[PDB]
C-alpha cells in the first residue's frame with residue numbers, strides 16, 4: 001500500500017460540494033482519483049485547483065487528443081507513473097484510435113505523429129524534467145507550428161501536470177486497477 | 188534576452204480586469220512578474236491560477252516563514268532558478284530574521300531550523316525532483332511533526348511550485364533585477 005498514512009482520503013459521499021470539480025476529473029477518467037478526494041479536505045485548495053483544471057477541457061487552440069498526449073509525455077518525463085497512468089487511461093477512453101495512444105511515448109519516431117505534435121510533445125518532455133532542459137531549438141519548433149494562443153495552452157497543460165505530479169507524489173497515490181492495466185499495456 | 192519569442196507579455200494597462208490577479212501576486216513580491224503578464228493573454232488561465240496562488244497566503248496551519256521556505260526549497264530542488272529567486276525575494280520582504288532565510292538551503296545542518304522544519308523541507312526537496320525520491324522516512328518525519336491539515340497545505344505549496352517551475356521554464360521568464368540581487372546574496 002501507500003507510504004503515506006498521515007493524510008487519508010475522505011469518502012465521496014462526504015464531500016458533495018465538490019461535485020463540479022469531481023465531474024471534470026471523473027468524466028474523462030471514469031473514476032475519482034484519491035488525490036482529489038484527499039484534496040477535498042481543504043476547500044480553498046480543492047475549488048481553486050478544480051477551477052484551474054477545467055481550463056484543460058476549455059482550451060480551444062490544440063486538439064483534444066494532443067492535450068492528453070502532452071499530459072502523458074509531461075508526466076512521463078517527470079517520472080510520475082501515477083499521473084502517467086491516469087493521462088494514458090484518459091487518452092484510451094477518449095481516442096478513437098487506440099494504436100496512436102500506445103505509440104505516444106515514441107512520438108519522435110512513430111508514424112502516428114506529425115511534426116506539429118512532435119514539436120509540442122518534445123517541448124512538454126523537456127519542460128517537465130528537473131531541471132528543465134528546454135533549449136532554443138524547442139522554442140523555435142514550437143513557434144513554427146503553433147500560435148501564441150496554442151503555446152499558452154500547451155504550457156498551461158505542462159504546468160498543471162507539474163501540480164499533479166508533485167501532489168500525487170506527496171500523497172503517494174497508488175495506481176488504481178483500471179489505469180494499472182492501461183499502463184501495463186503501453187509498456 | 189529570452190529564448191521565448193512566440194508568446195510575449197502584455198502591458199499591465201491592457202488587462203485592467205486582471206487587477207485582482209496582479210495585486211495578490213505583487214503584494215508578496217513587491218513587483219509584477221513577467222510570468223503573470225504573459226499568462227494574462229489567457230484571462231481564464233490567469234484568474235484560475237491566481238485563485239490557486241492565493242491559497243498560499245490563506246493557509247492557516249503553517250507559519251508564513253515556513254511557507255516561503257518550502258517554496259524556496261521546492262523550486263531549488265527542481266532547478267528553477269527563476270522561482271528560487273522570486274520566493275527568496277518574498278522571504279526577505281516578509282521574514283523578521285534575514286539570517287534564517289539565507290541558511291534555508293542548508294536547513295539539514297544549519298541551527299536556525301529545528302527537526303520539525305527540516306522534516307518539512309526535506310519532504311519538499313524530495314517531492315520536487317523529477318522523479319521524486321520521496322521515501323518512507325520523509326512521510327514518518329512529516330507525520331511525527333505535522334497534522335493532516337498541515338501536511339495538505341505543505342504538499343499544496345510544493346504542487347503550486349510544480350506549476351510555477353514549469354510555467355516560468357516554458358516562458359523562459361528572465362530573472363528580474365531585485366530577485367537577481369537576492370539570489371546572488373543567498374548564493
Ligand SMILES: Brc1c[nH]c(Br)c1Br
Pocket residue numbers: 212216220221222223226240273274351355
Ligand atoms: Br506567474 C509568477 C511568476 N513568478 C511568480 Br512568484 C509567479 Br506567482
